[PDB]
Design a protein around this ligand. Structure first.
Ligand code: H6F
Ligand code: H6F
Lengths: 306, 306
């Protein structure tokens, strides 16, 4: 029992991190087989980032302008190519530590682990969600670009995020591993403006099930609701609508609680309208929306802490 | 910028985890050089755990009763020995992946990463604190025993925790890697009773500095206080006393905020007495005490998010 914000073990990704330096700029790259993937603004000067022409900056570089280092060993770049906002550096050596892997583009509301890196070395690992406005709430300093986000299925690493930039609100934005940004952002130092963020309703419900799974039951009431009426109340508190697909996804937790999804929706509706009256759930005074239903089952299914 | 509950990268520890089976029971072991360390109750039956005689249970086993597996490869046990609450199994093969490492016994209030494992395989990583009552708030199921807690200094892994048991409150207890329990606990299925937990004051202050470091400044007031008077107020809200050693430890954050420690103490005093009035700090509605001052600097020192 117990419930914590849990990340995936980072070992398989740690073996893929390298340092990429292009003259003035250094950031992290991801070394898979004989290709290093990194953000294309490694080729910018500070001057350039206000509105860079990347194709003109890349045109003026050859393979030898890119210094790639894996620990104490330098990797010779033998080809370079830009795919959307990502640079792909062909290297003379395939990574012996390349795990089984995929490139996936996640959907808003899904979670992943971030391995935060500086100079190609890991600093820490933490769990993030893709927000409905396609930002993430990470923890990233200067030099962190090229850090990746990932899920592990059993031996396969699904890379879904590469870190590119920070928005003044304290929020972060990046690309999938094909270089396409999440959200309406561009890799340029300029004001850009994101959608307003919303609460991931299906994830709050999954966390309420984890709370029940962990003995925290005070919030359960004796009511049910309809999907339509719940959605009318939730909409006012800036919650995403709950779909029947979401209800289906919560089936395992419901049938591992004997609490119908719409009954849990009636409990969440009462929490939204009345607040928590000083009480906590799983130690939190606010409702949590960064655990997916799969996250909860992945962590809890051996518990029952009723 | 941004601030997250960050764990250490788990790769170096992942390479040390093995499965240990003694007849009926399976749990995790830690393989370093040619020794596997695991909880001694691997030798118990369910029957035995109500009040086991470990020396009599161990007396009846030989090296070949212990099945140790590292992935698909079995390791032959060639010697066994009990140190306090930990079993040490000498094996015929030294672990090629043994990192540089130490065994340390941490103090209450310090944090560490937990690599939660089942059947010798990693499930997830998360950050924990040793509570003042020598429990931790982890996330552990059946089969998780032998999971370890650790800090990484730069290439050296300091192992400080091995997981042994759960207390009905949802809290967890274990040993250092020399088999000595943290707190007044014994490895036996019986009611035992812990001290009452308290809030780690120096860690709350470190987190307030991180909040300042991250642009969250509303709670700063124009007052100062004395150490003695702060401690008289904090004592009522079940906070640990702040010592001059604690004030010294907060020096880097203070001199990286230009906020004197006693000025931050005056701000915390006002928060304790008046509450937060609906506001949040770093997204939290409660004060956080599971980040040490070193944790904050480790994560934040490149930020300034004022
Ligand atoms: C890569 O390593 C670095 C990581 C940054 C560094 C700052 C601390 N935390 C991080 O995550 N990425 C950058 O420096 C990028 C480079 C460009 C080419 C993408 N630059 C930025 O992230 C800047 N962001 C902005 O200037 C900015 C983006 C979006 C908005 C939207 C609305 C209003 C303002 C706005 C600004 C930062 C400020 C360095
Ligand atoms: C090891 O794998 C396993 C891990 C447990 C399993 C239960 C789910 N979460 C965990 O962390 N450890 C055990 O099963 C140990 C074995 C014995 C020999 C240490 N047993 C327990 O943890 C039991 N704990 C108690 O029975 C208990 C401890 C302390 C108190 C204190 C006050 C009141 C009651 C009390 C009970 C659990 C219940 C299996």
């Amino acid at each position: 029992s117990g419930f914590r914000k849990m990340a995936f073990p980072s070992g398989k990704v740690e073996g893929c991190m390298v340092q990429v330096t292009c003259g003035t700029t250094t950031l992290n790259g991801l070394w898979l087989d004989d290709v290093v993937y990194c953000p294309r603004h490694v080729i910018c000067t500070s001057e350039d980032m206000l509105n860079p022409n990347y194709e003109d900056l890349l045109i003026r570089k050859s393979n030898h302008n890119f210094l790639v280092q894996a620990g104490n060993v330098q990797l010779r770049v033998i080809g370079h190519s830009m795919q959307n906002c990502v640079l792909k550096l062909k290297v003379d050596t395939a990574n012996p530590k390349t795990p089984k892997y995929k490139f996936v583009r996640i959907q808003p509301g899904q979670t992943f682990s971030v391995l935060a890196c500086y100079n190609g070395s890991p600093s820490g690992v933490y769990q993030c969600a893709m927000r409905p406005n396609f930002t993430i709430k990470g923890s990233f300093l200067n030099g962190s670009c090229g850090s990746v986000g990932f899920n592990i299925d059993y031996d396969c690493v699904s890379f879904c995020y590469m870190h590119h930039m920070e928005l003044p609100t304290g929020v972060h934005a990046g690309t999938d591993l094909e270089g396409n940004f999440y959200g309406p952002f561009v890799d340029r130092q300029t004001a850009q403006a994101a959608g307003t963020d919303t609460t991931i309703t299906v994830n709050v419900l999954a966390w309420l099930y984890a709370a029940v799974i962990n003995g925290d039951r005070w919030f359960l009431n004796r009511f049910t609701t309809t999907l339509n009426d719940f959605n009318l109340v939730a909409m006012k508190y800036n919650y995403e609508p709950l779909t029947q697909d979401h209800v289906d996804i919560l089936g395992p937790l419901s049938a591992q609680t004997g609490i119908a999804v719409l009954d849990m929706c009636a409990s969440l509706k009462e929490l939204l309208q009345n607040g928590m009256n000083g009480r906590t759930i799983l130690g939190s005074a606010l409702l949590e929306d960064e655990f997916t239903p799969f996250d909860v089952v992945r962590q809890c299914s051996g518990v029952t802490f009723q």
